[PDB]
C-alpha cells in the first residue's frame, strides 16, 4: 500500500527516467517545425521501391524501440518484474511506446511528422504500401497532439503503456498489476496537482493502441511474403523478433 | 532472445 510520498517518489522516478531516455529533445522537435519537405522532395520519397522505405522505417522504428528499451531498464518497478515477464511488456509494449511518444514528432496544424530531419505529411509513405496503416497512425497522433501533454504526462503515460497487466503470458500477473496501480495512483496524482484529469476521460482506448499494434504486424505480413529477402537480409534483427510472425 | 541480451539477463 503505497503512501503518499512513495508516490510522490514514484512520480519523480518515471519523470527521471523518461527525461534520461526521451531521444529527442522536445525543443528540438518544435524548433524543426518550419522544416517541411517541399514537393520535389516528398515525391522523391513517394517514388522509392516499397523495399527500400520499408527499410528506412524499420531502422527509424528500431532505434527508438532501443531507447524504449532503456525507458524500461530504469523503471525502478520494471526490473522488479521476473525475466519472463520484463520480455512480454517490452515485446507486446515497445511499439505502443514508440506510437505515443512520436505525437510530440506530429504537428497538428499541418498534420506533418519529424522524419528524416524535415517534416512531412503523410502522403511521405505512400511507397510503404499500407496507407490505411499510415492513415490511422497519423489520425492517432492527431488525437494524442489535441490533449496537449507535457514532458512528465508523456513519461507517466508510457510508463502505463509499458506496465500493462493485460498482456497473455505473464507469470506474475498480481505483480505486474500492483505496479500497475500504483503507477496509475502516480499518473492520477500528477494529474491532480495540475488540474489535468479532464484528460484520463480523451486517451485512447487500451484497444486502440493494441489495434493500432496487430496493424502493423499484418502489413508486414503482406511486406515480408512480397519480400521475403530483404528482410532477412537488411532489416533490424529486433525488428524481426518482435513484429515478424 | 535479443530483447533478453539487451535487458542484460
Ligand atoms: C519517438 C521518440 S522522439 O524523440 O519523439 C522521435 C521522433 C521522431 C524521430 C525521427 C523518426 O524516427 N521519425 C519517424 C516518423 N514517422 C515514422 O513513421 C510514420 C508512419 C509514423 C508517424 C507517427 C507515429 C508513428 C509512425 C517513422 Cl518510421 C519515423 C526520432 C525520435
Redesign the interface.
Given at each position: 500500500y503505497a503512501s503518499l510520498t512513495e508516490i510522490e517518489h514514484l512520480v519523480q522516478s518515471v519523470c527521471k527516467s523518461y527525461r534520461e531516455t526521451c531521444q529527442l529533445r522536445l525543443e528540438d522537435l518544435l524548433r524543426q517545425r518550419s522544416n517541411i519537405f517541399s514537393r520535389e522532395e516528398v515525391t522523391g520519397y513517394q517514388r522509392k521501391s516499397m523495399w527500400e522505405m520499408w527499410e528506412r522505417c524499420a531502422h527509424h522504428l528500431t532505434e527508438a524501440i532501443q531507447y524504449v528499451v532503456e525507458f524500461a531498464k530504469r523503471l525502478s518497478g520494471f526490473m522488479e518484474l521476473c525475466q519472463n515477464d520484463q520480455i512480454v511488456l517490452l515485446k507486446a509494449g515497445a511499439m505502443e511506446v514508440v506510437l505515443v511518444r512520436m505525437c510530440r514528432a506530429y504537428n497538428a496544424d499541418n498534420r506533418t511528422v519529424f522524419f528524416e530531419g524535415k517534416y512531412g505529411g503523410m502522403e511521405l509513405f505512400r511507397a510503404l504500401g499500407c496507407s490505411e496503416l499510415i492513415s490511422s497512425i497519423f489520425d492517432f497522433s492527431h488525437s494524442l497532439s489535441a490533449l496537449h501533454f507535457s514532458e512528465d504526462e508523456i513519461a507517466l503515460y508510457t510508463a502505463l503503456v509499458l506496465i500493462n497487466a493485460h498482456r497473455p503470458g505473464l507469470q506474475e500477473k498480481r505483480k505486474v498489476e500492483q505496479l500497475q496501480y500504483n503507477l496509475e495512483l502516480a499518473f492520477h496524482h500528477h494529474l491532480s496537482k495540475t488540474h489535468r484529469q479532464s484528460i484520463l476521460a480523451k486517451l485512447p482506448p487500451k484497444g486502440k493502441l493494441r489495434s493500432l499494434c496487430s496493424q502493423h504486424v499484418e502489413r508486414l505480413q503482406i511486406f515480408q511474403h512480397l519480400h521475403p529477402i530483404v528482410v532477412q537480409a537488411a532489416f533490424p534483427p529486433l525488428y524481426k523478433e518482435l513484429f515478424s510472425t | 532472445?535479443?530483447?533478453?541480451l539487451?535487458?542484460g539477463?
Open positions: - | 532472445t535479443l530483447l533478453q539487451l535487458l539477463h
